[PDB]
Amino acid sequence: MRLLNRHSFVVKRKVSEDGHYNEDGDWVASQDVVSINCKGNIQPYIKGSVKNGTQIVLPEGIRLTDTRILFTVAELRTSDDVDWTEADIVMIKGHEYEVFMTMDWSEQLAHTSHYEYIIIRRDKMNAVRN
Amino acid sequence: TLTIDGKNKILATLTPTTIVLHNVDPTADPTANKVTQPVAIFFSEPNNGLIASEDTVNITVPASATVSHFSLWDDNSKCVATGALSSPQFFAEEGIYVISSVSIDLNK
Amino acid sequence: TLTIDGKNKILATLTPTTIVLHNVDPTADPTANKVTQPVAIFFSEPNNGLIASEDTVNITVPASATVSHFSLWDDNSKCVATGALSSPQFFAEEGIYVISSVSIDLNK
Amino acid sequence: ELTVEAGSRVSLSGYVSDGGTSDVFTICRLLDAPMNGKSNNCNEIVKIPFDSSCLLGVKLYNCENKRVNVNSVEAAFITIDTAFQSPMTVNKESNRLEYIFSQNDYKVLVKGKVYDMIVNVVDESGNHSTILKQKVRFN
């Protein structure tokens, strides 16, 4: 019973890596997004500044943010400006997450090679298309 | 009072064809501050001085848009009528507003 | 004091079947002020010394009547329990009084 | 030199006609129903108090992940395993498929058994489809 596959989530990958800038000037993300279940371990990230499940009392309201670490064997990507990659979205309890920062232990050992990801909850924002 | 036969004949030239939703009241200017795109609405034949929509109409409203008032148009871009829907609606994500029944009537 | 097993066998013999409404308290005479007509009422099996009806009872109250009391009647046609209505209801016109829940019990 | 006593108590409640459709309210159970198929883990056991009368709340999520109205479906059937089969209520107003349990249903049930709740919906084109397969325990 590997702990590396305890939790099971759904990842949205922008498979059709297009991500072009329209003639007007705005950003048009990939039109084709697929959602396939993966497996991994999601744990709170405890390191100094990083805040987990912390409500921030702004003079505009109360915003909530969190940062979890993700141990998994899947090769989730992150937004890259050279290969025109556009990150991966993890889901916990419905809320969308983003894979900022990556550690790549892919080849090192035999039965223990794994990726470590830092997933961050996406802030609430009004959505406009382009 | 006016005659129903007259009321039927007078209403046979309106023929609205497209419907457009506005966030603000278009009475002052029905040519401004549009939200959706012109979507076809087909009306019935004049009966008892009251025309009605034949089939339901689905208008795709973009995201972060509000619809509060509606307007009808004809082939030559001439706003025959304006009105207000039941209540304002805010579509956070891209949604659809369905028109269940439009009944232009003159029978007071 | 009685036991639960003792009380359950007691209530297994009531079987009230008809209910009639009164304007003043029957107590002394259950044959007076028979405002309504006996209408069937169904009870349940005793549970911890308590019986409850299964469904609402629609009593056809005649017009110009003020219903304020209540008294059960079994198959033997001999009243076994009397109670108030908790509020005097005056049906100025012909109405339909409805009972939501009856409960006869001996838990003190 | 010994005497045991007792007492009586009778209660009533009326809601004088009003020509309505009563005000029936007794339940807390409302269930999910994704049409695409839902952490799998182990499904939880819905617990209805034996006796009483619960109102099963089934919410039709369309098959991307969105609530959908109770449309197309013209017949809905609750078919708790080897107990009974009764039609449900397609509620336009609350936009839910609901069913209330009565005393008659409990005459064919036993307190404690973990039955399976299977919900079938039939559209206009006569296509039976299983929506839910939750397990219920009447404790």
Q: Which residue has the tokens 């007007």?
A: A24
Q: Look-up: residue for tokens 């001996």?
A: C106
Give the C-alpha separation, C98 to D13, whole Å.
9
Q: Based on C-alpha coordinates, what's the Rg of chain A?
A: 16
Partner chains of D (3+ C-beta pairs under 8 Å): A, C
Look up residue C24 and give its two tokens.
């003043």
Enumerate the residues of chain C whose CB falls inside 8 A of the CB of residue D14: 85-87, 89, 97-100
Contacts of D1 (CB under 8 A, 6+ apart): none
Q: Which residues are CB-contacts of D90 (< 8 A; sequence separation ≥ 6)?
A: D70, D73, D74, D76, D97
**What distance in Å separates residue B53's CA from the closest CA in chain A?**
31
What was the experiment behind these coordinates? Answer: cryo-EM
A9 CB neighbours in chain D (<8 A) are 39
Tell me whether strands A61-65 and A20-21 are parallel, antiparallel or unpaired. Answer: unpaired
Are A127 and B93 a contacting pair at CB < 8 A?
Answer: yes
Spatial neighbors of D107 by CB under 8 A, at least 6 apart, are none
Nearest-Cα residue of chain D relative to residue A39: D39
Give the β-pairing of D30-31 and D55-58.
parallel
Beta pairing partners, A95: A92
The Cα A73–Cα D127 span in angstroms is: 41
One-letter amino acid for residue C92 of the chain: A
Q: Which of C100, C26, C25, C22 is nearest to C61 (CA)?
A: C22
Nearest to D90 by CA among D72, D117, D64, D102: D72
The amino acid at C8: N
Residues C47, C11 contacting (CB under 8 angstroms)? no
